[PDB]
UniProtKB/TrEMBL annotation, chain A:
This is endopeptidase La. Coiled coil: none annotated. Belongs to the peptidase S16 family. The chain holds residues 99 to 147 of 719 of the full protein.
TrEMBL record, chain D:
This is endopeptidase La. It comes from Meiothermus taiwanensis. Belongs to the peptidase S16 family. The chain holds residues 245 to 293 of 719 of the full protein.
Length: 49, 49, 195, 49
């Protein structure tokens, strides 16, 4: 039974999995990673310009 | 307390938290923020249970 | 990289909750880590997660130990021995999962005794499957021929004791098989007459 | 485009070679020896991937 409630909570934590994608740390790294690939794209864009 | 000692502003988004301040946050501060938020939403899951 | 991240801190979150479960359930390691990987795949790919397909299906429970589980199954047909694998119909589509696995006689005789009629095994033609289940520990729920998608059930170590019961004539049709004498070695013969 | 029509299907798991892969198949039959072609039925029509 205890394993049953543990499994039920684990299944219900898909909401937590979705919520952690809008965390300050996740958003921070995402913005930084976008900044780095956009810096590469801006270097290419400046060469093209 | 740790954020204030470091000199950053703790902006809450609700269940989540984030740090507003100049430039990248220290790695230890980021790890502590992530662990605190993860524990908070784990406590929310335990509240559901 | 975003998909890799939504797997990296997928596991990074999941480990904190899974560690106490591993501590309290050291014998469910494979299931718990598989569920962790499934949650990681959900977080990364975004594929929907089916609650029915990931749930431990209760077979039996032992509120006892004196007496041990004594499962007399006189109708030892394959669905009644190894259990049934029933399906759900979704718009004419056959579907199945772990939660739709039903326990037979073998799954409630564990840690105890399974008493079968040798005449029943002979009549229902299930002796071959039962012999494989005894030797290899291969229990497999019976399936329906019109449902093509099945579930690959792993072998299950057999902890039960099988005590067949039957008339001598009913066993004369079974002792010819050498695997029978390999498995069953205790002959509890009843004298037809007492002094 | 159906993603299920395009996937590298896994068949085995790597081993160090010692012990080598010893596969014992006490139940010798066509589906368990040569493998199985399972389908999905869409409204009474068998389709494969």
């Amino acid at each position: 039974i205890h394993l049953a409630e543990a499994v039920e909570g684990l299944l219900l934590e898909v909401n937590r999995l979705d919520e952690l994608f809008r965390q300050g740390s996740f958003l921070r790294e995402k913005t930084q990673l976008e900044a780095r690939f956009k810096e590469a794209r801006e270097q290419q864009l400046e060469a093209l310009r | 307390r740790e954020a204030q000692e470091a000199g950053f502003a703790l902006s809450t988004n609700g269940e989540r938290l984030e740090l507003t301040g100049p430039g990248p946050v220290p790695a230890e501060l980021s790890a502590r923020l992530e662990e605190v938020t993860l524990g908070s939403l784990a406590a929310s899951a335990e509240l559901e249970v | 990289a975003l998909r890799r991240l939504r797997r990296d801190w997928a596991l990074h979150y999941l480990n904190n909750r899974f560690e106490p479960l591993f501590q309290r359930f050291p014998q469910a390691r494979a299931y718990l880590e598989a569920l962790r990987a499934r949650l990681a795949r959900y977080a990364e790919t975004g594929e929907p997660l089916d609650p029915a397909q990931w749930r431990p299906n209760l077979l039996t429970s032992s509120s006892s130990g004196t007496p041990p589980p004594i499962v007399y199954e006189p109708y030892a047909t394959a669905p009644r021995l190894f259990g049934r694998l029933d399906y759900l119909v979704d718009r004419g589509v056959w579907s199945t999962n772990v939660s739709l696995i039903r326990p037979g006689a073998v799954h409630r005789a564990q840690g105890g005794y399974l008493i079968l009629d040798a005449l029943s095994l002979k009549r229902e033609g299930t002796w071959e499957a039962f012999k494989r289940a005894l030797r290899n520990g291969q229990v497999e729920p019976v399936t329906e021929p019109q449902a093509p998608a099945g579930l690959e059930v792993e072998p299950f170590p057999i902890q039960m004791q099988v005590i067949l019961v039957g008339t001598p004539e009913a066993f004369e049709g079974l002792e010819e098989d050498p695997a029978f004498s390999e498995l069953f070695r205790i002959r509890a013969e009843f004298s037809p007459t007492l002094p």
